Amino acid sequence: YPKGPLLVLPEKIYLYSEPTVKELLPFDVVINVAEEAAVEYHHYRWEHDSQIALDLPSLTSIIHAATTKREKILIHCQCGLSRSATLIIAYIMKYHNLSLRHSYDLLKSRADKINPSIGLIFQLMEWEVALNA
Numbered sequence: 001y002p003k004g005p006l007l008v009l010p011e012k013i014y015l016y017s018e019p020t021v022k023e024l025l026p027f028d029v030v031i032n033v034a035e036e037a038a039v040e041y042h043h044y045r046w047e048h049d050s051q052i053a054l055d056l057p058s059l060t061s062i063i064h065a066a067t068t069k070r071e072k073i074l075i076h077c078q079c080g081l082s083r084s085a086t087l088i089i090a091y092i093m094k095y096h097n098l099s100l101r102h103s104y105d106l107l108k109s110r111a112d113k114i115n116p117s118i119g120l121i122f123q124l125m126e127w128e129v130a131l132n133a
Contacts, residue, residue: 028071
């Protein structure tokens, strides 16, 4: 397990899990994707994994808006690293026009412990088709 929020991408995107009030301090945008619970803050509570697909344009749009503002963005769940990884991968796929394989590989290489479900991987396949159409 970690060592504080993890810088996973050069554009200052951070991955983590259930931070403290002290650990949320350096961030300008926070995305919380955990199931239950200064400045820009977003909270999605998907009970089911199948629900992510509808929120991908908005969520990846939010992340990209953060990088355009050159801001530190934190994306976290608990414990749990499936939905948040999926989200980061969906962002890379769209805004860096990279394949699912490459996007996953990039994130994997930096955050070894990630494992989105097969459900979420199929979701990302669906996302790719929607990007190429």
